[PDB]
């Protein structure tokens, strides 16, 4: 007998196997598709087509929604805004927001994306993006060194702010002059006007 095919569509699997049977039929199959997220683990259509007549002894193939198409957004540190948006725009995302951040990096240039790359998220997602001021450089260990080599080795990596040096240290004739405690520590991220304390050996 040929039947016409009911409309299960937006019903569960199961739900949709029971109303397709209470039409007579008997064989199904689950295939899947993207779709909008309310329609996730539901079904969004059959083949043969909703309201088409077909033999009962076929298989009718119920397609079940899976979602947003995803995408695993990559990795654009470093890269600048202009150059990061466009490789993001081959992934398909045309979304963004943007953001300043103290950063050692070049202004202009992403340190990082939120959400953050390697996460799974929908192509027409909005993606957040970190933006360096290129207003920070990297604390260099200054142990050791005399204040007419340190201060130039400070000065060339950025630094225009103010020196605070606090009072001489006991740490023996071997450390005369030389630096023996600094702050901010070493490989921290300091503003370039910031403020570096020193104190040196008597």
Do not use: C
């Amino acid at each position: 007998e040929q039947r016409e095919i009911p409309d299960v569509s937006t019903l569960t699997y199961a739900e949709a196997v029971k109303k397709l049977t209470a039409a007579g039929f008997g064989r199904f199959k689950q295939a899947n598709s993207p779709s909008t997220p309310e329609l996730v683990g539901k079904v969004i259509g059959t083949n043969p087509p909703a309201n088409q007549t077909s033999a009962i002894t076929n298989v009718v193939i119920i397609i079940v929604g899976s979602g947003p198409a995803t995408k695993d957004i990559p990795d654009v540190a470093g890269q600048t805004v202009d150059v990061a948006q466009k490789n993001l725009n081959v992934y398909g995302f045309t979304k963004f927001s943007q953001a300043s951040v103290d950063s050692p990096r070049p202004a202009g240039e992403v340190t990082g994306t939120n959400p953050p790359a390697g996460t799974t998220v929908p192509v027409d997602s909005v993606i957040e993006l970190q933006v360096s001021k290129g207003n920070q450089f990297v604390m260099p260990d200054l142990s050791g060194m005399f204040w007419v080599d340190a201060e130039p080795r400070l000065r060339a990596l950025g630094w225009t702010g103010m020196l605070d040096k606090g009072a001489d240290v006991d740490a023996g004739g071997s450390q005369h002059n030389r630096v023996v405690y600094q702050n901010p520590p070493a490989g921290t991220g300091v503003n370039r006007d910031g403020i570096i304390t020193l104190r040196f050996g008597q």
